[PDB]
Design a protein around this ligand. Structure first.
Ligand SMILES: *[C@@H]1O[C@H](CO)[C@@H](O[C@@H]2O[C@H](CO)[C@@H](O[C@@H]3O[C@H](CO[C@H]4O[C@H](CO)[C@@H](O)[C@H](O[C@H]5O[C@H](CO)[C@@H](O)[C@H](O)[C@@H]5O)[C@@H]4O)[C@@H](O)[C@H](O[C@H]4O[C@H](CO)[C@@H](O)[C@H](O)[C@@H]4O)[C@@H]3O)[C@H](O)[C@H]2NC(C)=O)[C@H](O)[C@H]1NC(C)=O
Ligand SMILES: *[C@H]1O[C@H](CO)[C@@H](O[C@@H]2O[C@H](CO)[C@@H](O[C@@H]3O[C@H](CO[C@H]4O[C@H](CO)[C@@H](O)[C@H](O[C@H]5O[C@H](CO)[C@@H](O)[C@H](O)[C@@H]5O)[C@@H]4O)[C@@H](O)[C@H](O[C@H]4O[C@H](CO)[C@@H](O)[C@H](O)[C@@H]4O)[C@@H]3O)[C@H](O)[C@H]2NC(C)=O)[C@H](O)[C@H]1NC(C)=O
Ligand SMILES: *[C@@H]1O[C@H](CO)[C@@H](O[C@@H]2O[C@H](CO)[C@@H](O[C@@H]3O[C@H](CO[C@H]4O[C@H](CO)[C@@H](O)[C@H](O)[C@@H]4O)[C@@H](O)[C@H](O[C@H]4O[C@H](CO)[C@@H](O)[C@H](O)[C@@H]4O)[C@@H]3O)[C@H](O)[C@H]2NC(C)=O)[C@H](O)[C@H]1NC(C)=O
Ligand SMILES: *[C@@H]1O[C@H](CO)[C@@H](O[C@@H]2O[C@H](CO)[C@@H](O[C@@H]3O[C@H](CO[C@H]4O[C@H](CO)[C@@H](O)[C@H](O[C@H]5O[C@H](CO)[C@@H](O)[C@H](O)[C@@H]5O)[C@@H]4O)[C@@H](O)[C@H](O)[C@@H]3O)[C@H](O)[C@H]2NC(C)=O)[C@H](O)[C@H]1NC(C)=O
Ligand SMILES: *[C@@H]1O[C@H](CO)[C@@H](O[C@@H]2O[C@H](CO)[C@@H](O[C@@H]3O[C@H](CO)[C@@H](O)[C@H](O[C@H]4O[C@H](CO)[C@@H](O)[C@H](O)[C@@H]4O)[C@@H]3O)[C@H](O)[C@H]2NC(C)=O)[C@H](O)[C@H]1NC(C)=O
Ligand SMILES: *[C@@H]1O[C@H](CO)[C@@H](O[C@@H]2O[C@H](CO)[C@@H](O[C@@H]3O[C@H](CO)[C@@H](O)[C@H](O[C@H]4O[C@H](CO)[C@@H](O)[C@H](O)[C@@H]4O)[C@@H]3O)[C@H](O)[C@H]2NC(C)=O)[C@H](O)[C@H]1NC(C)=O
Ligand SMILES: *[C@@H]1O[C@H](CO)[C@@H](O[C@@H]2O[C@H](CO)[C@@H](O[C@@H]3O[C@H](CO)[C@@H](O)[C@H](O)[C@@H]3O)[C@H](O)[C@H]2NC(C)=O)[C@H](O)[C@H]1NC(C)=O
Ligand SMILES: *[C@@H]1O[C@H](CO)[C@@H](O[C@@H]2O[C@H](CO)[C@@H](O)[C@H](O)[C@H]2NC(C)=O)[C@H](O)[C@H]1NC(C)=O
Ligand code: NAG
Ligand code: NAG
Length: 1171
């Protein structure tokens, strides 16, 4: 569905109201007043707006000339009131000292607009909604129609009354309009602001928010100023009341109003709405039918009426309770107690006069003790509190007793609240939230339910929106319908839809309509699971919370089939579809198809109740495991090798599989080892292997080798063992020694027995991977594969001739020395004399255990201790070299003795290991900031030696980058205290020092001045920067943060104090700098780890928008915008206008460039160029 809507094409909207007969919607706006249909189509548009005028002018230009300058200004609709009696609309504007309009009801024809007399003027105030009031009428000939109206005054105390009682004549042209009900030279039916109270408190004013007629009175919810709370402005939200029949204005009352939530004050009215409570809230709030109630909205505190806080609270007042607070206060002043206490009205406090009277609710005020205030602030019952999104508006209504509340939000959202304090629940609960102007257009106070009370017109700054009170049809399921709780919604069982009682046909009958989730349609089928192969199966259906279906019912499995059913007891009996019908469904979905079996009612003809119904298919299972150990009742036939539901369809009795453990499967043994090109049998074990029956062949082993697949026939010895016959196998590659191969055991040609563990045959080759004795004895003792001296190759005893009783050698337990060790290459080629180096030797024919190579390794004379974990047997030794300080040699060859330094069992390295002692002499900055982060370049000799390197400045470690013969480059850590620091480099067990080469911690560079204090949006101009220690940073750069973007640019250092920098581009398509200029969010410099320089607090650097220049003996004149910026001091751009290469002498002006020419033209200023 879509929300019916009226969009405000050009201007903001201010007020909305609904005609109780028609449902036409009238809409007050700035410069416009619209008539709209119930579904928000435009019906008529009145122009009321842009008027040539001025607020300062009294009587507006129409009546008298004003010396103040006039301008086309907007006319804001301040007020809107339906006068049904005189078939019209009072449409009160502003911007003419507040003259009022009369528009005819059905066409908006201006009937009248009185503006001659002073009463025809209402207020200068140009603010929308700060005004309110009520229209009240009697029959024609009797006491005529009156308007009670409050407005702000703006300090124009003597021009306008804030509250007034005014006359509404039947002729709109009649001059008597908006005249006071009773005017006297002593007392008029109006209430003015006293001049003395405006002198004392400068801009006190009364803003009228909401207003309503009740029984015989007229109430107003108001906002006022600090008068006992010159200083600052703080507001107090109050209730006002008058008797309708009090021309003298003596009935005026004024009590402060608000409410508190866990010690948090809410004292600013944003809206209100008088309503009924209906049977529900009335009863447990203790009220009579026609007793009224007032829903309200307050913001937190007493601050900023112009822009209130998010924190907002919906409170409640029963009018009987406000009536009692007023009666209680009057029966109190008529006891003579205290003062009247009304600051803004009576500055000097007059006292309460005692008198004997019958104080009633009918009391309409008397001559003495006059207009009076209120001491005890009236507290309201809180209901719902929003903390992240401020309430703005409210309405409410009676629905079948339960009291529904509507609440606008700053976001453009409406809340639908059941108030349940008087209802059973713990506290009043939100039911639902809805969207109007999602982008964040706030909802306005004027929020009216339609006449039929089916919709709720919700107004924003920019759009009216028809939001339905009931729209239960968005609810798809009984479970969600009654789950939303918004009380209009019930499940109309047989129509399977969610809607109100009056909308569900026959709802009054038993079980036809559901209102509590427990009434939900609940359905079950006895034979939940039915096989594809079955047909017309009898099923029984149990359903609860369903009306009398003696009308008739059909079963529809989905929109595929439909079978007739008959009714007995509390059960429904229908049949499954035919095999002819069932399979059209199940085709494609294979294993099973869960299908939603519905009930189609004969009365409605709509599916309402559902169940999970399963269509299972046994035959499509193509293995025992899937068949039995699946999820369903399926039987496997060992012998036919087919899955089916029927026991009898099996071959015969003793071939039925019902249990998963009884399935034909191959069991594992310890791994199947198969050498290539060797005649071997492969015995297998298994379980429940079938005796092949009539017309059935025997067993075979099929090997799935990509190169060659072998078919070898086998013998089944019993139900538990197999064996493929003597054969040899191969694969073409010689690429991988150990190849695992999928094998399938077949019988009768194509029946493959199940292989759960997925047992494989490993085809291994006596080595196509190992041409070294050490590699063979390295591999599995299982393979039986071993090294054969004479051949110079490696194969089994089987494949190698015994010319000697010990000609074939196998690693017995690894106690097998292996001949002629050889070293290929070793890493680190160089090392420190001190030792500690990890030598990484890689050979081919080494020892097979660690404890023989340990003690064997030596570097010339120097004892080398080998490492266990890092040793890879007969391929690689990792060894730690000892102290070589005492060695005379500079370089020595590496030696391994396998176990004993025997003459055949020794290896010597092809090239030799070199000992050096690295030294360093210079550092390439010798200075750097205390924070660190400096790129250091240590120069020396032999710096690339050994394994590990660690550089320590002041004991603290340097972050290493890269190493060289001649250089070590690392990044400096933070220094503790500024000044000279030791540089310690340790390579393995060698720790080299130099006290002549030190590092000097500085002092951190500083930034003092940037000279020009500005640049343009694209940047690129020269900046003459000054500071200290600038030569100690090799690559400094400028940083600037504009908006959400951060950008950087380069610098060129000259002195320790001077630097030229190219200004950073801030080019943002989101924000452009103004003509006036703008500071960046951040500005600074990136200098290593000195982070205090990244953000400059004191900087006044400005960014102007991207010079503008216009193209095509007398001098050159070049015109354009943005040539000169509004910069502090003298400082301006050094412009140079050039011709091919020759610069000119020019005088620069704000719009023009005065170059001088003797008769390709380029203009330069910093990093800027244009032709
Ligand atoms: C429950 O589930 C079962 C199994 O999943 C469904 O039964 C299948 O029905 C469909 C028909 O729509 C079959 O698919 C078609 O197969 C034919 C050729 O089938 C041949 O190959 C089979 C596969 O090995 C083999 O089983 C067949 O032998 C059977 O039939 C004989 C005689 O009745 C019987 O004695 C045997 O015991 C077997 O039962 C047969 O040799 C093929 O023409 C189709 O392929 C074409 O279309 C596809 C898709 O467009 C396309 O990709 C191809 O290129 C080709 O053009 C098609 O695949 C399927 O074979 C049946 N399954 C089995 C095991 O037989 C069935 O939906 C459900 N059962 C019921 C009762 O509803
Ligand atoms: C290290 O190197 C840096 C930059 O490389 C040096 O900074 C500059 O030094 C030179 C001298 O070596 C100075 O140039 C001289 O300027 C004067 C006239 O100054 C006027 O013109 C300037 C250039 O347009 C302008 O910036 C000046 O504005 C400054 O002063 C105002 C007001 O006091 C101040 O508010 C600003 O902040 C500016 O700082 C000013 O209007 C000129 O007379 C010199 O000419 C002489 O020298 C040349 C060459 O030797 C010779 O040929 C002539 O005959 C003549 O005798 C010269 O052009 C420049 O002022 C320095 N820049 C700054 C920003 O101060 C820096 O001095 C070196 N540092 C160290 C520690 O050694
Ligand atoms: C289903 O059918 C399967 C397969 O047909 C049977 O499995 C066989 O079980 C028997 C036990 O009866 C196993 O027989 C044993 O074989 C050993 C032979 O290994 C040697 O083979 C060759 C040639 O002799 C040598 O070169 C090689 O070096 C091996 O050493 C014998 O050593 C065993 O004999 C020992 O046990 C018996 C009985 O206790 C004693 O009498 C002997 O003195 C001796 O101690 C033994 O005979 C045979 O390996 C299995 N077959 C296969 C093919 O592997 C199942 O028994 C049967 N299952 C059921 C439930 O009925
Ligand atoms: C497929 O659909 C069928 C619909 O028929 C579902 O079957 C029902 O499954 C549930 C459990 O999953 C059973 O509920 C249990 O009942 C137990 C008591 O069982 C006895 O009483 C049964 C009814 O009175 C009776 O059917 C049953 O006899 C069965 O066993 C006999 C011996 O094996 C066999 O010969 C008969 O044919 C028959 O099948 C017992 O005497 C109780 O102890 C449990 O706590 C539980 O409540 C239903 O009884 C099943 N209904 C039937 C008619 O058997 C089935 O769930 C669906 N399959 C899947 C996978 O979802
Ligand atoms: C102005 O607003 C009015 C209402 O304020 C509105 O006119 C109404 O439209 C509704 C439908 O939106 C109509 O209600 C129909 O009543 C007839 C019986 O006479 C039914 O046959 C209709 O049922 C149909 O629609 C159902 C729901 O979509 C279907 O389930 C069903 O199969 C039928 O097709 C329906 O209930 C109604 O005619 C008027 N209301 C009145 C009082 O006449 C309209 O949307 C707005 N018009 C304009 C010009 O802006
Ligand atoms: C509840 O269930 C009952 C019984 O299960 C079911 O009755 C069905 O009624 C339809 C008529 O609506 C029957 O279909 C007819 O059968 C004749 C042959 O005898 C066909 O030639 C007709 O089919 C034509 O029309 C179809 C629909 O327009 C087309 O799809 C088709 O191409 C043909 O032109 C005709 O429809 C049907 O035989 C019975 N069902 C059975 C199982 O016999 C009924 O739907 C349900 N009852 C109610 C009141 O809804
Ligand atoms: C040797 O056998 C192995 C294992 O049987 C084969 O590898 C894998 O085979 C399995 C079948 O069990 C495949 O798994 C499948 O996964 C999908 C997941 O979407 C699932 O839907 C299927 O039901 C099935 O279980 C798997 O794809 C396959 N592996 C690869 C990488 O394809 C292997 O194919 C055999 N080797 C050769 C050379 O054929
Ligand atoms: C066959 O069914 C068995 C028994 O139900 C399944 O056994 C599972 O085995 C794993 C071990 O791999 C256990 O951790 C699970 O707890 C077992 N599951 C259950 C439910 O008992 C097995 O998954 C099924 N196998 C196949 C191939 O379908
Ligand atoms: C072949 O297998 C048979 C039976 O297992 C056995 O007697 C014979 O030793 C095997 N022959 C060869 C050459 O391996
Ligand atoms: C270290 O640097 C500081 C600040 O630049 C300097 O004053 C001091 O002389 C330097 N120390 C040495 C030993 O040169």
């Amino acid at each position: 569905p879509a929300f019916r809507t009226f969009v405000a094409s050009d201007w903001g909207l201010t007020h909305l109201v609904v005609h109780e007969q028609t449902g036409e919607v009238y809409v007050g706006a700035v410069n416009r007043i619209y008539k709209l249909s119930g579904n928000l189509t435009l019906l008529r548009a009145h122009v009321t707006g842009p008027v040539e005028d001025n607020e300062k002018c009294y009587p507006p230009p129409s009546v008298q000339s004003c010396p103040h300058g006039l301008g086309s200004t907007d006319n804001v609709n301040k007020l809107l009131l339906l006068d049904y009696a005189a078939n019209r609309l009072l449409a009160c504007g502003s911007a003419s000292q507040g003259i009022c309009q009369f528009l005819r009801l059905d066409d908006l024809f201006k009937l009248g607009e009185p503006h001659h007399r002073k009463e025809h003027y209402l207020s200068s105030v140009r603010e929308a909604g700060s005004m309110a009031g009520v229209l009240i009428a009697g029959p024609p000939g009797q006491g005529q129609a009156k308007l009670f109206v409050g407005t702000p005054i703006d300090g124009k105390s003597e021009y306008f009354p804030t509250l007034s009682s005014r006359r509404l004549m039947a002729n709109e042209e009649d001059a008597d309009m908006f005249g006071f009900v009773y005017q006297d030279e002593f007392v008029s039916s109006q209430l003015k602001i006293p001049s003395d109270t405006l002198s004392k408190f400068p801009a006190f004013d009364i803003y009228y928010v909401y207003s309503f007629r009740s029984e015989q009175f007229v109430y107003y919810l108001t906002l006022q100023l600090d008068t006992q709370l010159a200083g600052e402005h703080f507001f107090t939200s109050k209730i006002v009341r008058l008797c309708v029949n009090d021309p003298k204005f003596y009935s005026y009352v004024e009590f402060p109003i608000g409410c508190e939530q866990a010690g948090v004050e809410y004292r600013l009215v944003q809206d209100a709405y008088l309503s009924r409570p209906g049977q529900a809230l009335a009863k447990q709030l203790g009220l009579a039918e026609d007793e009224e109630v007032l829903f309200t909205v307050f913001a937190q505190g007493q601050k900023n009426r112009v822009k209130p806080p998010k924190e907002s609270a919906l409170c409640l007042f029963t009018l009987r309770a406000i009536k009692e607070k007023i009666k209680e206060r009057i029966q109190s002043c008529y006891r003579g107690e205290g003062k009247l206490s009304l600051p803004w009205l009576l500055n000097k406090e007059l006292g309460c006069i005692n008198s004997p009277l019958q104080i009633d609710d009918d009391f309409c005020g008397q001559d003495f003790n006059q207009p009076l205030g209120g001491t005890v602030t009236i507290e309201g019952t809180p209901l719902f509190v929003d903390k992240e999104d401020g309430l703005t508006a409210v309405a409410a209504y009676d629905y079948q007793g339960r009291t529904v509340v509507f609440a606008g939000t700053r976001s453009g959202r409406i809340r639908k609240i059941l108030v349940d304090l008087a209802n059973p629940s713990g506290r009043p609960a939100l039911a639902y939230e809805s969207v109007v102007a999602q982008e964040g257009n706030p909802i306005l106070r004027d929020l009216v339910l339609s006449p039929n009370r089916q919709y709720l017109y919700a107004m924003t700054e920019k759009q009216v929106t028809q939001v339905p009170v009931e729209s239960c049809v968005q609810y798809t399921s009984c479970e969600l319908c009654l789950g939303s709780r918004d009380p209009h919604c019930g499940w109309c069982v047989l129509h399977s839809i969610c809607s109100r009682q009056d909308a569900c046909e026959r709802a009054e009958e038993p079980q036809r309509f559901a209102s509590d989730l427990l009434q939900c349609v609940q359905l079950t089928v006895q034979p939940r699971n039915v096989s594809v192969t079955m047909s017309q199966v009898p099923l029984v259906l149990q359903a609860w919370n369903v009306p009398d279906l003696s009308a008739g019912v059909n079963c529809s499995f989905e929109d595929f089939t439909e079978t007739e059913s008959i009714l007995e007891d509390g059960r429904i009996h229908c049949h499954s579809p035919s095999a002819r019908e069932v399979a059209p469904i199940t085709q494609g979905q294979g294993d099973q198809r869960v299908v939603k079996l519905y009930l189609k009612s004969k009365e409605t003809g709509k599916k309402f109740a559902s169940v999970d119904f399963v269509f299972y298919n046994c035959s499509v299972h193509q293995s025992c495991l899937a068949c039995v150990n699946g999820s369903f009742p399926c039987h496997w036939c060992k012998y036919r090798h087919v899955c089916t539901n029927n026991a009898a369809d099996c071959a015969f009795l003793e071939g039925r599989v019902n249990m998963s453990e009884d399935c034909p499967q191959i069991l594992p043994s310890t791994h199947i080892y198969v050498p290539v090109g060797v005649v071997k049998p492969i015995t297998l074990a298994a379980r429940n292997l079938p005796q092949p029956q009539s017309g059935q062949r025997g067993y075979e082993c099929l090997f799935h080798i990509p190169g060659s697949p072998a078919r070898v026939t086998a013998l089944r010895f019993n139900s538990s063992s197999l064996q493929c016959q003597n054969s040899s196998y191969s694969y073409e590659g010689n690429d991988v020694s150990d190849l695992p191969v999928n094998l399938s055991v077949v019988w009768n040609g194509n029946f493959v027995i199940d292989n759960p563990q997925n047992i494989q045959a490993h085809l291994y080759k006596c080595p196509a991977l190992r041409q070294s004795c050490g590699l063979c004895l390295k591999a599995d003792p299982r393979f039986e594969c071993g090294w054969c001296v004479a051949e110079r190759r490696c194969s089994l005893r089987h494949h190698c001739p015994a010319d000697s009783p010990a000609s074939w050698m196998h690693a017995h337990h690894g106690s097998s020395r292996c001949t002629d060790p050889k070293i290929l290459k070793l890493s680190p080629e160089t090392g420190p004399r001190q030792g500690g180096t990890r030598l990484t030797i890689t050979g081919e024919n080494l020892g097979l255990r660690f404890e023989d190579v340990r003690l064997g390794v030596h570097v010339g004379k120097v004892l080398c201790s080998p490492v266990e974990s890092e040793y890879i047997s007969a391929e690689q030794i990792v060894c730690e070299i000892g102290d070589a300080s005492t060695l005379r040699a500079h370089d020595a060859l590496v030696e391994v003795c396998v176990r004993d330094c025997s003459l055949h069992y020794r290896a010597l390295s092809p090239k030799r290991f070199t000992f050096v002692t690295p030294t360093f002499y210079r550092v390439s900055p010798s200075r750097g900031p205390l924070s660190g982060g400096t790129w250091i370049g240590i120069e020396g000799s032999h710096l690339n030696a050994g394994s590990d390197v660690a550089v320590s400045i002041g004991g603290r470690p340097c972050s290493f980058s890269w190493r060289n013969s001649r250089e070590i480059r690392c990044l400096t850590p933070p220094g503790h205290t500024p000044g000279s620091a030791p540089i310690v480099i340790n390579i393995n067990r060698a720790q080299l020092s130099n006290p002549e080469v030190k590092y000097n911690y500085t002092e951190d560079p500083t930034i003092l001045r940037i000279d020009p204090e500005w640049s343009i949006n694209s940047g690129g101009t020269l900046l003459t920067v000054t500071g200290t220690n600038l030569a100690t940073v090799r690559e400094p750069r400028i940083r600037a943060k504009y908006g959400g973007i951060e950008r950087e640019n380069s610098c060129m250092v000259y002195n320790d104090t001077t630097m030229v920098c190219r200004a950073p581009s801030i080019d943002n398509p989101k924000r452009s700098p103004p003509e006036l200029g703008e500071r960046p969010d951040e500005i600074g410099f990136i200098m290593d780890n000195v982070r205090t320089l990244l953000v400059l607090n004191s900087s006044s650097f400005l960014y102007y928008p991207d010079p503008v220049l216009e193209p095509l003996s007398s001098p050159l004149i070049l015109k354009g915008r943005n040539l000169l910026p509004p910069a502090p001091g003298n400082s301006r751009l050094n412009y140079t206008v050039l011709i091919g290469s020759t610069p000119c002498i020019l005088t620069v002006s704000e719009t023009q460039l005065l170059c001088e020419a003797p008769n390709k033209v380029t203009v330069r200023a910093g990093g800027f160029e244009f032709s």
